Amino acid sequence: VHLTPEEKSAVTALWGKVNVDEVGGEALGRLLVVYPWTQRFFESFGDLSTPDAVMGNPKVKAHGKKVLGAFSDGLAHLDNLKGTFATLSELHCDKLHVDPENFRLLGNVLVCVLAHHFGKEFTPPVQAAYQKVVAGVANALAHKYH
Amino acid sequence: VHLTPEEKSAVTALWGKVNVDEVGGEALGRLLVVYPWTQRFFESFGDLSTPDAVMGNPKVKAHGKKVLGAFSDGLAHLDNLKGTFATLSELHCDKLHVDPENFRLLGNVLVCVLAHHFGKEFTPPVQAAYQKVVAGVANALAHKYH
Amino acid sequence: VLSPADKTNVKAAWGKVGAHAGEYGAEALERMFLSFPTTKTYFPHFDLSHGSAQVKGHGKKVADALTNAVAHVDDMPNALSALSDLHAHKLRVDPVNFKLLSHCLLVTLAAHLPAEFTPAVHASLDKFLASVSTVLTSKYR
Amino acid sequence: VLSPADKTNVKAAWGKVGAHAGEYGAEALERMFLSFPTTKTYFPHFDLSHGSAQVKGHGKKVADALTNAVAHVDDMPNALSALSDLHAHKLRVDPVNFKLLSHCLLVTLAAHLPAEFTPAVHASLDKFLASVSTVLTSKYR
Ligand code: HEM
Ligand code: HEM
Ligand code: HEM
Ligand code: HEM
Ligand SMILES: *Cc1cc(OC)ccc1OCc1cccc(CO)n1
Ligand SMILES: *Cc1cc(OC)ccc1OCc1cccc(CO)n1
């Protein structure tokens, strides 16, 4: 992914303020609530019967944190996303068989969450920069398919 | 690089009976009729105002023939679809900006056309083999997006 | 959203299916299971072997449902409410799977009724199945 | 298909926009044009520069159309027929572009109305926009 130095700075500035304890879980949680069929991949996560149940679920928050961490690693290796996510891609594609469109969905849900947390600070330019990142991460995750 | 020895034999055998001058035009014509927004990429082709107009358009039939020729090139190099369509990928992605979902739709329309022509001969196993071919062609064309 | 011509085309084509609905339903399922193996995971306890009596029975279930949807093309949400509860609420079927079965239904139709499978009818049947899929994958209760 | 709950969620949330319609509509467009450059190809005659007065005005038309859609949530095909003629018959907009704008509208709502953008409301707003998108991209006349 190609981010202008101005975009890199903006992205990094915002990411450094992200609440690593909640953002990931809210992103994964919203994914499960907005696109309920994605719940089928988290059978063992316990109660996902209602929105509040999903969002407050300890396993959802913990797993969302790992998801967030994968994005943080992606930001730290924008020049090599395919290698960085090789392991994760084998897992999500060869084992879980997650449809690529869902990767895109989560990437955008994350964008919505960042917008939710930062409000006006999440300007159109900052979003555009993040859209390049999530698209890049999403692509890398589905590369084991190609 | 996907695709079993038996699936390759099935694809090759059926393809030897395909009418190269008709199938492509029928597939492209149906793409334009079933998914009307695709007509936007063929503004210079003339009258596309009705199903009969589309299916009777000489330019649509002529172009479908080139499209089918490319599919044939792919079937002759099943283990290297990425290379076979590299140039076409640049054109459709970088130049024309055709959303990849459309590549998948054309592939499935082609499958419908094969089913239509072959009838009972287009058995579930033959279809399964062809689904692998069109999915591979679609991914190869979207390569410039990866 | 279906046009008046779409409704006309769907009713005529499905009518032509007639008493073969069950047979075509089973073939479409078999085509889906074989072409897109991941779809089998939605049926963990089914006998999905070729020619399976269970699949034959399910094909008839699916076909009859479509016949019902065709009869209520102007009132599908209400007509398919129970089927939505099942696919959307309980099974939570990923919508991509409905596109797969919808495609196999079209392939099955094209393979059996060539004279009826015109570009216009093809287009109409696709919109209809996409509409049905939307209703079954949405939780509207 | 929207549930009674989705309808009330959308009305309450979108109702908060109010006099911010043009502002939010314009912002949603700016976000789409900047994040997904390919969308600009549908507005070749437009001045798409940031702050553009043309984009601001168009943002208002889009916002107002949504407000109208919310008001006619039970008969959108009828209420949105003019817009469908425009986007599906004349412009032949690829449906993927509607997903992009819908995403940007959600982003805009989340950035301005954090209290309104709950998980359930987010789900309803998404279904609502997908519904409007389907109508605007279908040729049903
Ligand atoms: C595109 C962004 C995504 C990222 C960055 C991501 C990241 C991760 C990470 C870091 C793990 C943990 C792997 C490990 O500990 O070995 C994981 C596991 C998993 N992911 Fe994803 N994921 C993404 C999308 C998805 C989607 C869309 C689904 C499906 C709806 C999904 C389903 C799963 C499942 C089922 C697991 C296994 C959890 C368990 O049972 O332990 N992921 N993901
Ligand atoms: C997925 C299979 C597809 C194959 C194998 C294919 C193949 C071709 C070929 C062989 C050409 C000729 C290139 C040249 O010599 O300049 C071409 C051109 C083109 N294709 Fe495709 N194509 C595919 C899908 C699509 C789709 C889905 C669209 C858009 C909906 C599309 C739109 C076009 C356009 C606009 C041109 C240029 C036509 C012109 O000369 O005006 N193609 N394609
Ligand atoms: C044209 C769309 C579809 C129609 C009309 C349809 C119709 C039906 C009908 C009539 C039943 C029987 C309900 C009952 O037992 O009372 C059923 C069950 C079921 N359907 Fe579908 N269906 C569709 C697509 C799908 C898809 C795409 C999947 C997943 C790949 C799916 C998965 C299931 C499953 C798992 C069951 C329950 C099987 C069991 O008894 O365990 N359906 N469907
Ligand atoms: C569901 C979301 C959308 C809504 C509610 C919407 C609404 C509208 C409205 C109200 C107009 C003005 C019609 C008039 O009064 O003449 C319009 C025009 C237009 N829309 Fe959309 N639109 C949507 C999505 C899109 C998308 C996704 C694209 C393409 C990326 C698009 C491209 C256009 C274009 C090119 C025009 C014509 C502008 C002009 O030449 O004046 N719209 N839209
Ligand atoms: C008309 C239509 C077209 C597509 O894509 C081709 C998807 C869905 C759809 O409509 C589903 C539908 C049918 C009847 C009632 C409602 C909502 O009240 N949605
Ligand atoms: C309800 C609904 C959900 C989705 O999500 C994929 C897409 C479209 C859709 O409904 C469109 C709609 C709305 C109102 C009336 C009709 C047909 O009369 N279709």
Coordinates of all heavy atoms in Angstrom, one line a residue, chain A residues 63-117:
Chain A
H63 N -10.9 -11.3 21.5 CA -10.6 -11.7 20.2 C -10.4 -10.4 19.3 O -9.6 -10.3 18.5 CB -11.6 -12.6 19.6 CG -11.1 -13.3 18.4 ND1 -11.3 -12.9 17.1 CD2 -10.3 -14.4 18.3 CE1 -10.6 -13.7 16.3 NE2 -10.0 -14.6 17.0
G64 N -11.3 -9.4 19.6 CA -11.2 -8.2 18.8 C -9.9 -7.5 19.1 O -9.4 -6.8 18.2
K65 N -9.3 -7.7 20.3 CA -8.1 -7.1 20.6 C -7.0 -7.7 19.7 O -6.0 -7.0 19.3 CB -7.8 -7.4 22.1 CG -6.5 -6.6 22.6 CD -6.5 -6.6 24.1 CE -5.4 -5.8 24.7 NZ -5.4 -5.8 26.2
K66 N -7.1 -9.0 19.5 CA -6.1 -9.7 18.6 C -6.2 -9.2 17.2 O -5.2 -9.0 16.5 CB -6.3 -11.2 18.7 CG -6.1 -11.8 20.0 CD -6.3 -13.3 20.0 CE -6.2 -13.9 21.4 NZ -6.6 -15.4 21.5
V67 N -7.5 -9.0 16.8 CA -7.7 -8.5 15.5 C -7.1 -7.1 15.3 O -6.4 -6.8 14.4 CB -9.3 -8.3 15.2 CG1 -9.6 -7.7 13.9 CG2 -9.9 -9.7 15.3
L68 N -7.3 -6.2 16.3 CA -6.7 -4.9 16.3 C -5.2 -5.0 16.3 O -4.5 -4.3 15.5 CB -7.1 -4.2 17.6 CG -6.9 -2.7 17.7 CD1 -7.7 -2.0 16.6 CD2 -7.3 -2.1 19.0
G69 N -4.6 -6.0 17.0 CA -3.2 -6.1 17.0 C -2.7 -6.5 15.6 O -1.5 -6.2 15.3
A70 N -3.5 -7.3 14.9 CA -3.1 -7.7 13.6 C -3.0 -6.5 12.7 O -2.2 -6.3 11.8 CB -4.0 -8.7 13.0
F71 N -4.0 -5.5 12.9 CA -4.0 -4.3 12.1 C -2.8 -3.4 12.5 O -2.2 -2.8 11.6 CB -5.3 -3.5 12.4 CG -6.4 -3.9 11.4 CD1 -7.4 -4.8 11.9 CD2 -6.5 -3.4 10.1 CE1 -8.4 -5.2 11.0 CE2 -7.5 -3.8 9.3 CZ -8.5 -4.7 9.7
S72 N -2.4 -3.4 13.8 CA -1.3 -2.7 14.2 C 0.0 -3.2 13.6 O 0.9 -2.4 13.2 CB -1.2 -2.7 15.7 OG -2.2 -2.0 16.4
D73 N 0.1 -4.5 13.4 CA 1.3 -5.1 12.8 C 1.2 -4.8 11.3 O 2.3 -4.6 10.7 CB 1.2 -6.6 13.0 CG 1.4 -7.1 14.4 OD1 2.2 -6.4 15.1 OD2 0.8 -8.1 14.8
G74 N 0.1 -4.7 10.7 CA -0.1 -4.3 9.3 C 0.4 -2.9 9.1 O 1.1 -2.6 8.1
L75 N 0.1 -2.0 10.0 CA 0.5 -0.6 9.9 C 2.0 -0.5 10.0 O 2.6 0.4 9.4 CB -0.2 0.2 11.0 CG -1.6 0.7 10.7 CD1 -2.2 1.3 11.9 CD2 -1.6 1.7 9.5
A76 N 2.6 -1.4 10.8 CA 4.1 -1.4 11.0 C 4.8 -2.1 9.8 O 6.0 -2.1 9.8 CB 4.4 -2.1 12.3
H77 N 4.1 -2.7 8.9 CA 4.7 -3.4 7.8 C 3.9 -3.2 6.5 O 3.6 -4.1 5.8 CB 4.9 -4.9 8.0 CG 5.8 -5.2 9.2 ND1 5.3 -5.3 10.5 CD2 7.1 -5.4 9.3 CE1 6.3 -5.5 11.3 NE2 7.4 -5.6 10.6
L78 N 3.6 -1.9 6.2 CA 2.8 -1.6 5.0 C 3.5 -2.0 3.7 O 2.9 -2.3 2.7 CB 2.5 -0.1 4.9 CG 1.5 0.4 6.0 CD1 1.4 1.9 5.9 CD2 0.2 -0.3 5.9
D79 N 4.8 -2.2 3.8 CA 5.6 -2.6 2.6 C 5.6 -4.1 2.4 O 6.1 -4.6 1.3 CB 7.1 -2.0 2.7 CG 7.8 -2.7 3.9 OD1 7.3 -2.6 5.0 OD2 8.9 -3.2 3.6
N80 N 5.1 -4.8 3.3 CA 5.1 -6.3 3.2 C 3.9 -6.9 3.9 O 4.1 -7.8 4.8 CB 6.4 -6.8 3.8 CG 6.6 -8.3 3.4 OD1 6.4 -8.7 2.3 ND2 7.0 -9.1 4.4
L81 N 2.7 -6.5 3.5 CA 1.5 -7.1 4.1 C 1.2 -8.5 3.7 O 0.7 -9.3 4.6 CB 0.3 -6.2 3.6 CG 0.2 -4.8 4.1 CD1 -1.0 -4.1 3.5 CD2 0.1 -4.8 5.7
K82 N 1.6 -9.0 2.6 CA 1.4 -10.3 2.1 C 2.2 -11.3 3.0 O 1.7 -12.4 3.4 CB 1.8 -10.5 0.7 CG 1.4 -9.3 -0.2 CD 1.1 -9.8 -1.6 CE -0.3 -10.5 -1.7 NZ -0.7 -10.7 -3.0
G83 N 3.4 -11.0 3.3 CA 4.3 -11.8 4.2 C 3.8 -11.8 5.6 O 3.7 -12.8 6.3
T84 N 3.5 -10.5 6.1 CA 3.1 -10.3 7.4 C 1.8 -11.1 7.8 O 1.6 -11.6 8.9 CB 2.8 -8.8 7.7 OG1 4.0 -8.1 7.4 CG2 2.3 -8.6 9.1
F85 N 0.9 -11.3 6.8 CA -0.4 -12.0 7.0 C -0.4 -13.4 6.4 O -1.5 -14.0 6.4 CB -1.5 -11.1 6.4 CG -1.8 -9.9 7.2 CD1 -1.4 -8.7 6.8 CD2 -2.5 -10.0 8.5 CE1 -1.6 -7.5 7.6 CE2 -2.7 -8.8 9.2 CZ -2.3 -7.6 8.8
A86 N 0.7 -13.9 5.9 CA 0.8 -15.2 5.3 C 0.2 -16.3 6.3 O -0.7 -17.0 5.9 CB 2.2 -15.6 5.0
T87 N 0.6 -16.3 7.5 CA 0.1 -17.3 8.5 C -1.4 -17.1 8.7 O -2.2 -18.0 8.5 CB 0.8 -17.1 9.9 OG1 2.2 -17.2 9.7 CG2 0.3 -18.1 10.8
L88 N -1.8 -15.8 9.0 CA -3.2 -15.5 9.1 C -4.1 -15.9 7.9 O -5.2 -16.2 8.0 CB -3.4 -14.1 9.5 CG -3.1 -13.6 10.9 CD1 -3.2 -12.1 11.1 CD2 -4.0 -14.3 11.9
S89 N -3.5 -15.7 6.7 CA -4.2 -16.0 5.5 C -4.5 -17.5 5.3 O -5.5 -17.9 4.9 CB -3.4 -15.5 4.3 OG -4.2 -15.7 3.1
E90 N -3.4 -18.3 5.7 CA -3.6 -19.7 5.6 C -4.7 -20.1 6.5 O -5.6 -21.0 6.2 CB -2.3 -20.4 6.0 CG -1.1 -20.0 5.2 CD 0.1 -20.9 5.5 OE1 -0.1 -22.0 6.1 OE2 1.2 -20.6 5.1
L91 N -4.7 -19.5 7.7 CA -5.8 -19.8 8.7 C -7.2 -19.5 8.2 O -8.1 -20.3 8.2 CB -5.5 -19.1 10.0 CG -6.5 -19.2 11.1 CD1 -6.8 -20.7 11.5 CD2 -6.1 -18.4 12.3
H92 N -7.4 -18.2 7.8 CA -8.7 -17.8 7.4 C -9.2 -18.3 6.1 O -10.4 -18.4 5.9 CB -8.7 -16.2 7.3 CG -8.7 -15.6 8.6 ND1 -7.5 -15.4 9.4 CD2 -9.7 -15.0 9.4 CE1 -7.8 -14.7 10.5 NE2 -9.1 -14.5 10.6
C93 N -8.3 -18.7 5.2 CA -8.7 -19.2 3.9 C -8.7 -20.8 3.8 O -9.8 -21.3 3.6 CB -7.7 -18.7 2.8 SG -7.7 -16.9 2.6
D94 N -7.6 -21.4 4.0 CA -7.4 -22.8 4.0 C -8.2 -23.6 5.1 O -8.7 -24.7 4.8 CB -6.0 -23.3 4.0 CG -5.2 -22.7 2.9 OD1 -5.6 -22.7 1.8 OD2 -4.0 -22.2 3.2
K95 N -8.3 -23.0 6.3 CA -9.0 -23.7 7.4 C -10.4 -23.2 7.6 O -11.3 -24.0 7.5 CB -8.1 -23.5 8.7 CG -6.7 -24.0 8.5 CD -6.7 -25.5 8.1 CE -5.3 -26.0 8.0 NZ -5.4 -27.4 7.5
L96 N -10.6 -22.0 7.9 CA -11.9 -21.4 8.2 C -12.8 -21.2 7.0 O -14.0 -21.2 7.1 CB -11.7 -20.1 9.0 CG -11.0 -20.2 10.3 CD1 -10.6 -18.8 10.8 CD2 -11.8 -20.9 11.3
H97 N -12.2 -21.0 5.8 CA -12.9 -20.8 4.6 C -13.8 -19.6 4.7 O -15.0 -19.6 4.4 CB -13.7 -22.0 4.3 CG -12.9 -23.2 4.0 ND1 -12.0 -23.3 2.9 CD2 -12.7 -24.4 4.7 CE1 -11.4 -24.5 3.0 NE2 -11.8 -25.1 4.1
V98 N -13.3 -18.4 5.2 CA -14.0 -17.2 5.3 C -14.1 -16.6 3.9 O -13.1 -16.4 3.2 CB -13.3 -16.2 6.2 CG1 -14.0 -14.9 6.3 CG2 -13.1 -16.9 7.6
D99 N -15.3 -16.2 3.5 CA -15.5 -15.6 2.2 C -14.8 -14.2 2.2 O -15.1 -13.4 3.1 CB -16.9 -15.5 1.8 CG -17.1 -14.9 0.4 OD1 -17.1 -13.7 0.2 OD2 -17.3 -15.8 -0.5
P100 N -13.9 -13.9 1.2 CA -13.2 -12.6 1.1 C -14.0 -11.4 1.3 O -13.5 -10.4 1.9 CB -12.7 -12.7 -0.3 CG -12.4 -14.1 -0.5 CD -13.6 -14.8 0.1
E101 N -15.3 -11.4 0.9 CA -16.2 -10.2 1.1 C -16.3 -9.8 2.6 O -16.4 -8.7 2.9 CB -17.6 -10.5 0.5 CG -18.6 -9.4 0.8 CD -18.2 -8.0 0.2 OE1 -17.2 -7.9 -0.5 OE2 -19.0 -7.0 0.5
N102 N -16.2 -10.8 3.4 CA -16.3 -10.6 4.9 C -15.1 -9.8 5.4 O -15.2 -9.1 6.4 CB -16.5 -11.9 5.6 CG -17.9 -12.5 5.4 OD1 -18.9 -11.9 5.6 ND2 -17.9 -13.8 5.0
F103 N -13.9 -10.0 4.8 CA -12.7 -9.4 5.2 C -12.9 -7.9 4.9 O -12.5 -7.0 5.8 CB -11.5 -9.8 4.4 CG -11.1 -11.2 4.5 CD1 -10.7 -12.0 3.4 CD2 -11.1 -11.9 5.8 CE1 -10.3 -13.3 3.5 CE2 -10.7 -13.2 5.9 CZ -10.3 -13.9 4.8
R104 N -13.5 -7.6 3.8 CA -13.8 -6.2 3.4 C -14.7 -5.6 4.4 O -14.6 -4.5 4.8 CB -14.4 -6.2 2.0 CG -14.4 -4.8 1.4 CD -15.1 -4.8 0.0 NE -16.5 -5.1 0.1 CZ -17.4 -4.2 0.5 NH1 -17.0 -3.0 1.0 NH2 -18.7 -4.5 0.6
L105 N -15.8 -6.4 4.7 CA -16.8 -5.9 5.7 C -16.2 -5.5 7.0 O -16.5 -4.4 7.5 CB -17.8 -6.9 5.9 CG -18.7 -7.3 4.7 CD1 -19.8 -8.3 5.1 CD2 -19.3 -6.1 4.1
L106 N -15.3 -6.3 7.6 CA -14.7 -6.0 8.9 C -13.8 -4.8 8.7 O -13.7 -4.0 9.6 CB -13.9 -7.2 9.4 CG -13.2 -7.0 10.7 CD1 -14.2 -6.6 11.8 CD2 -12.5 -8.3 11.2
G107 N -13.0 -4.7 7.6 CA -12.2 -3.6 7.5 C -13.0 -2.3 7.5 O -12.6 -1.3 8.2
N108 N -14.1 -2.3 6.9 CA -15.0 -1.1 6.9 C -15.7 -0.8 8.2 O -15.9 0.3 8.6 CB -16.0 -1.1 5.7 CG -15.4 -0.9 4.4 OD1 -14.3 -0.3 4.3 ND2 -16.0 -1.3 3.3
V109 N -16.0 -1.9 8.9 CA -16.6 -1.8 10.2 C -15.6 -1.1 11.1 O -15.9 -0.2 11.9 CB -17.0 -3.2 10.8 CG1 -17.3 -3.0 12.3 CG2 -18.2 -3.7 10.1
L110 N -14.3 -1.5 11.0 CA -13.3 -0.9 11.8 C -13.3 0.6 11.5 O -13.2 1.5 12.4 CB -11.9 -1.5 11.5 CG -10.7 -0.8 12.1 CD1 -10.8 -0.8 13.6 CD2 -9.4 -1.6 11.7
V111 N -13.4 1.0 10.2 CA -13.4 2.4 9.8 C -14.5 3.1 10.5 O -14.4 4.3 11.0 CB -13.5 2.5 8.3 CG1 -13.7 4.0 7.9 CG2 -12.2 2.0 7.6
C112 N -15.7 2.5 10.6 CA -16.8 3.1 11.2 C -16.6 3.3 12.7 O -17.0 4.3 13.3 CB -18.1 2.2 11.0 SG -18.8 2.2 9.4
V113 N -15.9 2.3 13.3 CA -15.6 2.4 14.8 C -14.6 3.6 15.0 O -14.8 4.3 16.0 CB -15.0 1.1 15.3 CG1 -14.5 1.2 16.7 CG2 -16.2 0.0 15.3
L114 N -13.6 3.7 14.2 CA -12.6 4.8 14.3 C -13.4 6.1 14.2 O -13.2 7.1 15.0 CB -11.5 4.7 13.3 CG -10.6 3.6 13.4 CD1 -9.6 3.5 12.2 CD2 -9.7 3.7 14.7
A115 N -14.3 6.2 13.2 CA -15.1 7.4 13.0 C -15.9 7.7 14.3 O -16.1 8.8 14.7 CB -16.0 7.2 11.9
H116 N -16.5 6.6 14.9 CA -17.3 6.7 16.1 C -16.5 7.2 17.3 O -17.0 8.1 18.0 CB -17.8 5.3 16.4 CG -19.0 5.3 17.4 ND1 -19.3 4.3 18.2 CD2 -20.0 6.3 17.5 CE1 -20.4 4.6 18.9 NE2 -20.8 5.8 18.5
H117 N -15.3 6.7 17.5 CA -14.5 7.1 18.6 C -13.8 8.5 18.4 O -13.8 9.3 19.4 CB -13.3 6.1 18.8 CG -13.8 4.9 19.6 ND1 -13.1 4.5 20.7 CD2 -14.8 4.0 19.4 CE1 -13.7 3.4 21.2 NE2 -14.7 3.1 20.4

